[PDB]
Paper text:
Anelloviruses are nonpathogenic viruses that comprise a major portion of the human virome. Our determination of the LY1 structure demonstrates that ORF1 encodes the capsid protein and that anelloviruses evolved a novel spike domain that extends around the 5-fold axis to form a crown structure. The particle, formed by 60 jelly roll domain-containing ANV capsid proteins, forms an icosahedral particle core from which spike domains extend to form a salient part of the particle surface. The base of the spike domain, the P1 subdomain, shares some sequence conservation between ANV strains while a hypervariable region, forming the P2 subdomain, is at the spike domain apex.
To generate a higher resolution structure, we generated an ORF1 polypeptide lacking the C-terminus (ΔC-Term) in human cells (Expi 293) and determined its structure. To generate an increased number of particles to permit higher resolution structure determination, we generated an ARM-containing ΔC-Term ORF1 construct (residues 1-609) for expression in Expi 293 cells. Western blot and Coomassie-stained sodium dodecyl-sulfate polyacrylamide gel electrophoresis (SDS-PAGE) analysis of the ΔC-Term ORF1 construct purified from mammalian cells showed a principal band consistent with the expected size. Despite containing the N-terminal ARM region, the ΔC-Term ORF1 formed symmetrical particles similar to the ΔARM fragments produced in insect cells, suggesting the presence of the ARM region does not hinder particle formation. We determined the cryo-EM structure of the virus-like particles formed by the insect cell-derived ΔARM fragment to 3.9 Å resolution from 6271 particles and of the mammalian cell-derived LY1 ΔC-Term ORF1 particle using cryo-EM to 2.69 Å resolution from 22,743 particles. Despite being generated in two different cell lines and the presence of the ARM region in the mammalian virus-like particle (which is not visible in the density, suggesting flexibility) the two protomer structures are very similar (1.179 Å root mean square deviation when aligned over residues 48–562). Particles from both expression systems adopt comparable folds, including an icosahedral particle core. Absent from both structures is the majority of the C-terminal region (in the higher resolution ΔC-Term particle, we see density up to residue 562). The portion of the C-terminus we can see extends from the jelly roll core toward the surface near the 2-fold axis between the spike domain crowns. The local resolution of P1 is only slightly lower than the jelly roll domain (~3–3.5 Å), while the resolution of P2 is within 4.5–5 Å.
Author numbering:
A (entry chain T), D (entry chain V): 48 to 559
B (entry chain U): 52 to 102
C (entry chain U): 509 to 559
E (entry chain 0): 103 to 203
F (entry chain Y): 48 to 51
The structure:
């Protein structure tokens, strides 16, 4: 009727336990919401001592061989002349870290894939609620008899007890480990200081919409309405009334790509300027400079194009002294700030109309509406859960051009006390004129960030991490400390084959 | 008194974590509500020492 | 803050360093059963499924 | 810790078995897709011997008392002076019918409600697939030892074993019975004749859209496009060319509410007509008359309004003889049929874009789009399942004005061989100028259907029943035979109270 | 000649001709255990059935000729289903279990 | 079936 399937055992067999140590994460507080990869996108480890506070690890026999090239493991027996393999399962020992707790969960469903719900569920509170979790308290939160938790993991259900050629099974992922950094004793407070409210900086959506960033070859205009274009001007003027400011006081913005402040027409003789054309090229200010970004010195928004001001200057330079913001062409001169600061409270968030997506930063397209991938839009979770691991899910999905400079993250949230229709979160470093992860003693970008000084995901990273840190379970890590976690693994294999050849050494010239 | 059991039954354990208080010294004598009178969390990291 | 300071003069009231927030939590598990007549259900194509 | 709840038994108790017979359905073939109510909408039993091929019955102690007023049951003990009741459950005996099989299923979930999925699941093939069905073969399809199937049904889970006042429990529904008429031996063929394809008649959607029906006080126009109105004219002319027909040949349509054919201008002297105004009022034809409905005699569609023809006649009656359909104002004279016949095949139906809903017939609103209740739209089932019991779900829902004359049923189906964007199914009786359920020897509506002679659900009923009859499991019933099913019930009660009073009869004047 | 596959069973579910007792939406593995068939007596006509589960599926000229009612009725491992007219039975169907290919 |  029905028979057991039977295999004939190979002529020679050799047990091998691939034993070693795996880093689960190594994190600072400003990287807790990001995925730790030990083998990097080459910018990440530059001036960061830890890359991420959660990871997803896939282990395969080829990845175990790659860890042997790093000297991170031993093979108890070589496989050089036995081409068959018979995988029997794994032992893991998870160690208590000194300073940080952490949740683990693992899977062996042979089908390997990533999901948006998986990356959100890595959030420490959500992962801690899941079934078949393992919680590892730090040595500080619990002293234990054994300093580790040990468990045995069976092969994937698709990996049967049969022999397989090592070439076939080499790349088959035989284990997934998911880990997130946690605190049990600071679960609600986390790293909160003063109020429960966190402050988010954003680009004013009602004025900054053109997304025409990162060229010195283009005069910047902030919005289009109907057929019009609208333009921004800086001034150092002490004038109280927007009407009486001169046509000279304004510092027009003809670049977005640089950190440069520009300078006033009163410095014409310092830069040997002969015309308003040379004032435009030498003296124009980038709107995202540390004083213009929050209008520390006043910034003026208008329909009046710099080329209408060029016509007024070039028609007569002597009447450029006389002309004020009164009686100009299309004079919608107002006082507008490129940045607004919102307050977010996680306990006041109900997730009824929350939303999150990426838009293309370096393209000639207007507005902030969800565009491109509509299946990548993440909706209907509280912002601290909605943002957690979402950028890394998008990067691992590879459906966008990979570089942080070419996209912006945009999110909708009803629950900030002030509002903007979308939010374009910006990090305090970009709002203060400094590189994405550079120490606050610095007051300029580094040369590669002095270039490309415009809104993009590279400058948003610390702000969305700060929103994720408002969520529960997120750990408190002192500045300059890196928290770490490790597992010791032992994968059990047998190697199978016909009997191999061997060689020998002379007796006289041997260990004396 | 006897009841007739319904046709299909499904056990559910609603499992979770509840904050009992979060407090500074200057809020110890006040009731902690996690869902606030909107001024309380403005520049206070903990709202009350009992609940 | 004055009536909190008067309450802090009373016994059992904790000492918390300035800038530290003390916290407490419980883990709960409420046990329920859900009852009814048998519900409807739906299914996914075999070819377009977990590969 | 915890105690059993206990009740103290009442002073006197009297068992009563309410025993009787319930009709589950009584049906002809042309009523199989409709719900049987024994207590009618007063038009339904007029010239129909059976009202429906499925039913949903709710039984309550008050409905059992109402069946006692019809003499359909006995109470084994009266309840007159014992106000408490203790319901113990029910016994049902379902009898084999002579000629028809039938599926039963029952429920006792105290919460009583109707659903669109419930009414569709009454379809005989779908009901026969359900769990906890009972199939009762006819005496013809299976001879049995016992001529009935017997089962005991427990009280609703909300009805506990406690005593209740009879006033409180009177209206609580203690049982639901769902029954549908079936054939096991003709499951696929059913009542099919010739081809597997069924023919559906419909109103051309591309020309008949104005829905301005049922007034003799309004000149009918079939569609609006842009600012225009379009109009229909009948003719008995033998003319082969649409250009050369006279302005006289056309029989303009100024009524939709009547069965009247109208007559040609050549009969001016038979109706003492003096003007085209009297020709319009006496001689205009209804477009749904038995020759105009399918254009058996030619029917002409045009942008040219009858009032432009009035201006041509009234300006000079002598040039009305001379004028033809050439050189008329806005002359889009074409040959269009108000009806088209589609072919539907149930095995060719994939239900990918199937849809069904009711629109208001007597309102001044253009077009056929789903309107009013968007939650009542029924979608994504094959048309024989999608239509089954859907009109009765809508009637029982009471979200529309109840009368069949005030709504039309509209459905979308990709799978007819010819197509129309929506379909407006019409019964062969309305396509042949006869009352909704009147025998084919008749060639006119009855007086109440001579009035209101316009598209509405009352004239659609046999067409959607015919589409449901294309579906599997639907029975074959010879014309003039009514199939029937019955159950015998026994509800078990106790009556409770303090001891009642009693009276006596003289011995001398007694049974001699 | 009918061939049945799990995809043909899904297509019959789109026609509402079957039920699935449990959905498969989030469990991608399958373990087929076999089939039960109940063949019903028709009212008016008798009929021969035979079935196969040789995983290799193909058609042949000899197969189509052997469908002739007299030839099919001579084959081994036939099932004959008399009509209700030609034989009244205790059970109105013939039931048998079929193992996987 | 039934409970106290």
């Amino acid at each position: 009727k029905r028979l057991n399937i039977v295999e004939w055992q190979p002529k020679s067999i050799r047990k091998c336990r691939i034993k070693g140590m795996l880093c689960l994460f190594q994190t600072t507080e400003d990287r807790l919401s990001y995925n730790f990869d030990m083998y990097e996108e080459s910018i990440i480890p530059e001036k960061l001592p830890g890359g991420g506070g959660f990871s997803i690890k896939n282990i395969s026999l080829y990845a175990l061989y790659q860890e042997h090239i790093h000297a991170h493991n031993i093979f108890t027996h070589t496989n050089t002349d036995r081409p068959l393999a018979r995988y029997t399962g794994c032992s893991l020992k998870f160690y208590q870290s000194k300073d940080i707790d952490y949740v683990v969960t693992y899977s062996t469903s042979l089908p390997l894939r990533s999901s948006m719900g998986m990356y959100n569920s890595m959030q420490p509170s959500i992962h801690l609620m899941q079934q078949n979790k393992l919680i590892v308290p730090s040595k500080q939160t619990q002293k234990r008899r054994k300093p580790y938790i040990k468990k045995h993991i069976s092969p994937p259900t698709q990996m049967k007890s049969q022999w397989y050629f090592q070439h076939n099974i080499a790349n088959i992922p035989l284990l997934m480990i998911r880990t997130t950094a946690l605190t049990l004793d600071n679960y609600y407070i986390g790293s909160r200081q003063l109020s429960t409210n966190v402050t988010i900086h954003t680009l004013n959506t009602t004025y900054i919409q053109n997304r025409d960033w990162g060229d010195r070859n283009k005069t910047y205009y902030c919005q289009t309405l109907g057929t019009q274009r609208y333009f921004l001007y800086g001034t150092h003027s002490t004038a109280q009334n927007i009407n009486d400011i001169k046509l000279q006081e304004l510092i027009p913005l003809t670049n977005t790509q640089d950190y440069v402040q520009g300078f006033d027409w009163t410095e014409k003789d310092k830069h040997n300027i002969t015309t308003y054309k040379e004032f435009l090229t030498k003296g124009a200010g980038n709107p995202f400079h540390a004083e213009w970004i929050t209008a520390q010195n006043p910034v003026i928004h208008t329909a009046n194009s710099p080329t209408q001001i060029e016509q007024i200057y070039t028609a007569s330079t002597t009447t450029f002294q006389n002309k004020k913001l009164t009686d100009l062409p299309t004079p919608g001169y107002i006082f507008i700030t490129p940045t607004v600061s919102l307050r977010y409270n996680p306990y006041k968030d109900l997730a009824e109309r929350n939303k999150c997506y990426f838009v293309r930063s370096k393209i000639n397209a207007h507005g902030w509406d969800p565009e491109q991938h509509q299946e990548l839009i993440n909706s209907d979770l509280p912002q601290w859960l909605l943002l957690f691991g979402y950028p890394d899910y998008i990067k691992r999905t590879q459906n966008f051009a990979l570089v942080d400079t070419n996209y912006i993250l945009v999110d909708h949230c009803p629950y900030t006390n002030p509002e903007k229709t979308p939010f374009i979160p910006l990090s305090t470093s970009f709002i203060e004129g400094r590189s994405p992860y550079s120490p606050s003693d610095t007051h300029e970008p580094d040369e590669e960030d002095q270039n490309r000084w415009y809104p993009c995901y590279q400058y948003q990273q610390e702000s969305i991490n700060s929103i994720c840190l408002s969520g529960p379970g997120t750990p408190k890590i002192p500045k300059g400390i890196t928290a770490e976690a490790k597992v010791k693994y032992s994968f059990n294999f047998k190697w199978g084959g016909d009997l191999p050849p061997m060689s020998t050494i002379t007796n006289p010239t041997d260990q004396p």
